Each structure stands twice: as C-alpha cells, then as structure tokens.
Amino acid sequence: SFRFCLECNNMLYPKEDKENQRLLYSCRNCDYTELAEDPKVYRHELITNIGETAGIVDDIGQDPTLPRSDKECPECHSRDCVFFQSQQRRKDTNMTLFYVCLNCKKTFRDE
Amino acid sequence: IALDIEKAKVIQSSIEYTTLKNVTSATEIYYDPDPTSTVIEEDFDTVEAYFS
Amino acid sequence: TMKEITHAISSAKEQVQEIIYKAQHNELELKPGMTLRESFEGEVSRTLNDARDSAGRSAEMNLKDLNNVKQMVSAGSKGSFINIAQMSACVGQQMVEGKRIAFGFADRSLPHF
Ligand SMILES: [Zn+2]
Ligand SMILES: [Zn+2]
C-alpha cells in the first residue's frame, strides 16, 4: 500500500536523508514530507495466491446456476451450502472447492 | 548410467537449466541505515550470529 | 449383454467420480511434464475411452455368426469394430480439438447444467 499527499493528493515517493539517516515519504510536487512508519519500500511476489479467494460477493447465494451441497458449516452448522472452484483462471490453479453458507455467508474449505 | 536410475537422475539434474527465478519466491527492498545491525527482528538473530 | 454394458458404463462413471473427488481434495498424482488440470483431463479421457472399448468388446463378442453386420466386418468389405460399438453399445466421448467439450457458457457447457 502507498500513501497520498495530504495537501495536493499526489503520490508520496520515499526519500532518504543523508544527514539524518531516515526514510521519509515526500511529494515531488511540493515541500510536504511525512515520516515513514515501515522500511518495506517494495515487495514483489513471483508466485502469488491473491485473487484466489478474493473473488467473493455477499449475494452469491441468490445465483440459481450454482450447485448446492450439504456440507457442514464450521460456524453456525447449517445443512445447506453453495460451492464453487477457484476464481483465479491461470493454468497452475488448483481444483479445490470453496463453500459458502446460506446464513453466515463465509468462505471455508474442506481440508 | 542407462541401467541405473539414480545416476540417470543425477545426469538429468545436471543437464536441466535452473535459474534464480525458479527457486525464488518473493523479493523485498528494506531500508536499514546500520551496516553492522538491522531493524528486522526475525532475521536479527541470524545476522548478529553471522557478524559475531 | 445390455446389462453387462450398462454395468461397465456405470462402473466407469463411478471411477470418474472418484477421480473428480481425488482431484478436488489434492490427492491426485501429477503426470510429469503436465499440470494438474491436464493430467486430470487426460486420466478422465482415458477412463471413458476404456469404457467405450470394453462395452464395444462385450457387444461384439455377443454377436452370432448369422449376424449380418458381423459377416460384413469379418469379410473386411465394410465396417469395423467401432461401428458395431457405436451402433449397439455406446457412442462414447465427443472430442473437439482433442479435448472434451469446453465451457462455452460461464463455467458450463449448456444452460441445462
Ligand atoms: Zn504534495
Ligand atoms: Zn454458516
């Protein structure tokens, strides 16, 4: 996550002080400068799993084309649920199922 | 090597191309102005063990 | 023979169901040089092909010598084993571009599934 300038809404690029030895987020369109909280400047994931379970909506139980199972809900122990596979559509994607209860509407696995 | 499976697997491993990107999983950039110490707590023990 | 063919096809479908469950619980063996989805598709296709071949072999063994289709196939003048299998026992799996029927709709082949 990256922060924005509080006065002109531009991006806050990180900057390093030679004399003070501190990491600071500074806007290049002004003189505003705010002290950085964490040193994690950049992170790149070669193999990522985000978007696998992130594709979830709160009204997925109203879809009539989705199959319905009788798996046990971990939270409220309901007897009706709706399952589907991974929303990510790469070639390496697993065939595991995500179950959605019809009362608490949370996503849970079978393992 | 043709009638032994282990030597064949050794040859196969020695022939196949393997880059850093294959074994790498994630790369990160951190700010740390102390050459002899570090800010990260998980790796602090190992790096101080190295320096000592 | 029709009972035997029905039993073979039902056993194959149960086997395919077991393969589906194993692939959906990460208990499936991966063929080297191929992904999980490709290995699953190849194994299901192999099972269904074996099912059609077994049903056809049962049907072709049932036939008498006076059977006319058998006489034509045995003379070598017209027809083969696959024709007898498809006419009498099972048409089998339909392949488009060397793969099973794709999901032309949103995650299904027809709006009836
Ligand atoms: Zn600014
Ligand atoms: Zn529930």
CA-nearest of A84, A87, A78 to A63 is A84
| Sheet architecture: strand order including A68-69 | A68-69, A81-84, A98-101, A107-108
Q: What domains does chain A contain, in order, with CATH numbers?
A: 1-44 (2.20.25.10), 45-111 (2.20.25.10)
Q: Nearest ligand to the C-alpha of residue A77?
A: 2
DSSP letter assigned to residue A11: B
Contacts of B28 in chain A (CB under 8 A): 40, 42-44
* Interface check A41 vs B, CB under 8 A: yes
Asked if A91 and C40 come within 8 Å (Cβ–Cβ), the reply is no
| Proximal ligand: closest to the CA of A99 | 2
> Rounded to a whole number, what is the distance in angstroms from the first to the last CA of chain B?
46
**Which residues are CB-neighbours of A2 under 8 A, at least 6 positions away?**
A11, A12
- Judge whether A60 and A100 are in contact, CB under 8 Å: yes
What three-state secondary structure class fits A29? coil
Joined together, the tokens standing for residue C72 give 């034509």
Resolution in A: 3.6
For B50, what's the count of Cα atoms within 13 Å in the CB-facing half-sphere? 9
Q: Judge whether A35 is closer than 8 Å to chain C, CB to CB.
A: no
Cβ distance of A92 and C108 shorter than 8 Å: no
Rounded CA separation C28/C52 (Å): 24
Whole-angstrom Cα distance, residue C110 to residue C91?
20
Å between A36 CA and nearest CA of chain B: 10
Chains near C with 3+ CB pairs less than 8 A apart are: A
